[PDB]
């Protein structure tokens, strides 16, 4: 049985994958959606999450607890791509494929509201997109109800933790694991040029393009996204 | 402009009204969905919420900050009806109508996993329905993706706080506010008869019956629920 | 009970309202969707429909067979708006309200494939949009499955019948009936300026703007459209 | 590129496969959905289709127009299985695989409304399920809007033509072609036990079971069906 592990992006949570994993369940796949520390329904305030290793703990903890022979397919969205690659490097033997959905894919070896949990003279501890802008940047092609939903679940993102993502030494063993990049074509937040550049600097085994997706493929085009995942899996 | 305030039930949060408030937006209404303490994306652990007033703070706070002339229509689901009735008594002048959706409506004057936040020899501090039972009890008539959604969002409910709900002295002023009860007919958790019984013991201005709804009307029959709200609004 | 009657536009049929009437059914309204002659699953070839009254036969028959006191709300799409105005002129006593959804509403008194069922030297008998263009013009904001659906149901439209539409003598009785126009904001086929002009030249009781609708509001923004119809109903 | 050919069942048309072919498009497959004579948007009245080869004409013509080396995967639903088996025997060289979805698959060598197009003393020319029974029998597990859609698209079926389907002489060449049966588990029309019998009497290369599907898998469980098709293609 093939096991997906989904890693959300900044300010989001496991909740954002609800349409997608429901399909995969029905297709006989197992999916696990994590809440990174300070995200989703995590009891920890993201404003006290200053570390990459602390942010990724629920994901790393999950990969550690896998039985000796079990492997998973990692799927990351946006900044979640950083966590996927980091997890790709620490648990390489347990990853069969890494998928980057409009995500930060960086080879190992390479408007906003702010929260000042340590006072204003210190750099900000949390960042959150202002409510009046979330539709255009995150959900520009998504059903309106998903915007309502997101507006009640989005949490500030731990800025301090993001500064340490993807500062990794070259990893020849992780290079052997097949990667898949899925590009979002109508993404107002992660520009097409910036996505093409990630692909060019570290070409993946497969590349898909969601012609109609905004930043949030899991809301705007879940069935199409679903199809591409099964197709990437047929590859093995 | 008519202003609705939605109060979720046990283990749920503001997120559960995402389908309903979107319709109401299109209908020219304003809606506010609250996260009661320890629910939704509240940073406070529900296991330390031992008090009714502590649980209701986000709701009571919102009603306080209402402009001198502004009134709202309260809509409560399930145990949320208890918070509605209490808020109906403390902010009577600020409530134009109280709506009870498969909710506890008690006249002023009248399977589970447990968490032991004060050790196992003290009574439990939190209660949560086991994952294998939520589909049948909460969402038996709901889309599967809404079950998935809920499973990544349900948080333990503050049991101790619920013991104080609806222990209110008679309030003749609160009797003057028009009430509406909306009954869910295929509710596997709050049996149909008990709902009828609440209505009988304290007759509302109106009674609607969602013939096809499970416990979670906002997932299973949001458009019909939407329509009934519009009908209830037509009165005042 | 409030009764809606839906009249499709060129090449479409009753089938296109499937999302909308399902919502309306659940809200306790009655809806009837007709197939105009040569459309939907009509057994008659549209290339032999040369007459306005022939095309409208199914709509006219339904209004005729209406009980003495029963009224209906007419909702027309696109060229179907012409049929709405015509039926408004022949059955005023039976129409409580006429709604024009991105439809031709003209006051009484005021790329394509062609089929030549009568040879090439005679004027064309049928018109149908080329398959490669239906997505962009008809369904630019609509789900892909609906484009697929439409591609297996779209039939050529009877051009000859369209020339007699909205060629009506002034009707002061039809003027008393409340009209509502719903403008589609992202319509690649029926331009914004042209919609405003219909509104300017014959001001309706109400004006709605679907900020996110393509030409096919019933596919791209069905719930929002549903909400707007209930609103228009709230008046009379 | 792999080409699917979809054959609807009695009263249905190409329109019924709209969700499924959209998914397959996304997986990079080509699909063609046919309207058998008198079905879908066929201009021919089914009450004058008394003949099997006339009913199968749109399908047979399609297989005829296939380029010399090109093959297709035949997928039939319900009575469409008869057309599939028949096409399997007549165009064996053009079929790479035949798939039976809750369909009649019989080895070569082995409540209703009626229409009387030839008067009442002659046997009926058309059959159609009464409107009040289509939900339970066809769409017991399908979205309500698909029931609405179907109700405006279902056409009477040519009873007379059905008497000649699958009256075929043994075909050792057709036996070499790999078959797939996909069983519907919650089918109120083609009971689970009877489906098992077809498999027993003529064992397929593969057998899939849609645990949650009604008679109309293409409406009720499209993504799951989609997945099984991908699995079936994996057999090459």
Coordinates of C-alpha atoms in Angstrom, one line a residue, chain D residues 73-215:
Chain D
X73 CA -9.8 0.1 -24.9
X74 CA -13.5 -0.6 -24.9
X75 CA -15.5 0.3 -21.8
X76 CA -19.1 -0.6 -21.5
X77 CA -21.7 0.0 -18.9
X78 CA -24.8 -2.1 -18.1
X79 CA -26.4 -3.2 -21.4
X80 CA -23.5 -1.5 -23.2
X81 CA -21.5 -4.6 -22.4
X82 CA -23.5 -6.4 -25.1
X83 CA -22.3 -3.8 -27.7
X84 CA -18.8 -4.1 -26.3
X85 CA -18.7 -7.9 -26.7
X86 CA -20.3 -7.6 -30.1
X87 CA -17.7 -5.0 -31.1
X88 CA -15.0 -7.3 -29.6
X89 CA -16.0 -10.0 -32.1
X90 CA -16.3 -7.8 -35.2
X91 CA -13.3 -5.5 -34.7
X92 CA -11.1 -7.8 -32.7
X93 CA -8.0 -6.4 -34.4
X94 CA -8.8 -2.9 -33.2
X95 CA -9.4 -3.7 -29.5
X96 CA -6.5 -3.9 -27.0
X97 CA -8.8 -4.4 -24.0
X98 CA -12.5 -4.7 -23.2
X99 CA -13.8 -3.4 -19.8
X100 CA -17.1 -4.2 -18.2
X101 CA -18.5 -1.8 -15.7
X102 CA -21.6 -3.4 -14.0
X103 CA -22.1 -4.7 -17.6
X104 CA -23.4 -7.8 -19.4
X105 CA -20.3 -9.8 -20.4
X106 CA -21.4 -13.0 -22.0
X107 CA -19.0 -15.4 -23.8
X108 CA -19.6 -15.7 -27.6
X109 CA -21.3 -19.1 -28.0
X110 CA -23.7 -18.8 -25.0
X111 CA -41.7 0.4 -12.6
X112 CA -41.0 0.8 -16.4
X113 CA -42.8 3.1 -18.8
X114 CA -43.5 1.6 -22.2
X115 CA -44.0 3.3 -25.6
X116 CA -46.1 1.7 -28.3
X117 CA -44.9 3.3 -31.5
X118 CA -46.7 0.7 -33.5
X119 CA -50.1 0.6 -31.7
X120 CA -51.0 -1.2 -28.5
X121 CA -51.6 -4.6 -30.1
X122 CA -48.0 -4.7 -31.2
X123 CA -45.1 -5.1 -28.7
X124 CA -43.7 -1.9 -27.3
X125 CA -41.0 0.1 -29.2
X126 CA -39.5 2.0 -26.3
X127 CA -38.8 1.5 -22.6
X128 CA -38.0 4.1 -19.9
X129 CA -37.7 3.9 -16.1
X130 CA -40.5 5.9 -14.4
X131 CA -39.1 9.2 -13.0
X132 CA -39.9 8.3 -9.3
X133 CA -37.6 5.3 -9.5
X134 CA -34.5 6.5 -11.2
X135 CA -32.8 7.8 -8.0
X136 CA -33.2 4.5 -6.1
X137 CA -32.3 2.2 -9.0
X138 CA -29.7 4.1 -11.0
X139 CA -28.3 6.8 -8.7
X140 CA -28.8 5.5 -5.1
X141 CA -25.3 6.5 -4.2
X142 CA -24.9 9.5 -6.6
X143 CA -25.0 13.3 -6.0
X144 CA -28.5 14.8 -6.3
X145 CA -27.6 17.1 -9.1
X146 CA -26.6 14.1 -11.3
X147 CA -30.1 12.8 -10.7
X148 CA -31.5 16.1 -11.9
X149 CA -29.1 16.0 -14.9
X150 CA -30.1 12.5 -15.8
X151 CA -33.8 13.2 -15.5
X152 CA -33.5 15.7 -18.3
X153 CA -31.4 13.5 -20.5
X154 CA -32.7 9.9 -20.1
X155 CA -34.4 8.7 -23.3
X156 CA -36.6 5.6 -24.0
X157 CA -34.5 2.6 -24.9
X158 CA -35.0 0.6 -28.1
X159 CA -36.3 -2.7 -26.7
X160 CA -36.4 -4.4 -30.1
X161 CA -32.7 -3.9 -30.8
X162 CA -31.8 -5.4 -27.4
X163 CA -33.2 -8.9 -28.4
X164 CA -30.4 -9.3 -31.0
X165 CA -27.4 -8.2 -28.8
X166 CA -24.9 -10.9 -28.0
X167 CA -26.4 -13.6 -30.2
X168 CA -22.9 -14.4 -31.5
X169 CA -21.0 -17.5 -32.7
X170 CA -17.9 -18.5 -30.7
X171 CA -14.9 -16.3 -31.4
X172 CA -11.5 -17.9 -30.5
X173 CA -9.7 -14.7 -31.7
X174 CA -11.8 -12.5 -29.3
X175 CA -11.0 -14.9 -26.4
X176 CA -7.4 -13.8 -26.7
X177 CA -8.3 -10.1 -25.9
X178 CA -7.9 -9.2 -22.2
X179 CA -11.1 -8.4 -20.4
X180 CA -11.7 -6.5 -17.1
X181 CA -14.8 -6.7 -15.0
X182 CA -15.5 -3.9 -12.6
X183 CA -18.2 -4.9 -10.1
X184 CA -20.6 -2.4 -8.4
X185 CA -21.2 -3.3 -4.8
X186 CA -24.2 -1.2 -4.0
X187 CA -26.1 -1.7 -7.3
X188 CA -29.9 -1.7 -6.8
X189 CA -30.4 -2.8 -10.4
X190 CA -27.8 -5.4 -11.1
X191 CA -27.5 -7.3 -7.9
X192 CA -24.1 -8.2 -6.5
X193 CA -24.8 -12.0 -6.8
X194 CA -25.7 -11.8 -10.5
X195 CA -22.5 -9.9 -11.3
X196 CA -20.5 -12.6 -9.6
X197 CA -22.1 -15.1 -11.9
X198 CA -21.0 -13.4 -15.1
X199 CA -17.4 -13.6 -13.8
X200 CA -17.7 -17.2 -12.9
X201 CA -19.2 -18.2 -16.3
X202 CA -16.5 -16.3 -18.2
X203 CA -13.5 -15.5 -16.0
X204 CA -11.9 -12.1 -16.9
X205 CA -8.2 -11.2 -16.8
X206 CA -8.9 -8.9 -14.0
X207 CA -11.6 -8.2 -11.4
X208 CA -12.1 -4.9 -9.5
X209 CA -14.7 -4.1 -6.9
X210 CA -16.1 -0.6 -6.3
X211 CA -17.2 -1.0 -2.7
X212 CA -19.3 2.2 -2.6
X213 CA -20.8 2.4 -6.1
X214 CA -24.4 2.3 -7.1
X215 CA -25.4 1.3 -10.6

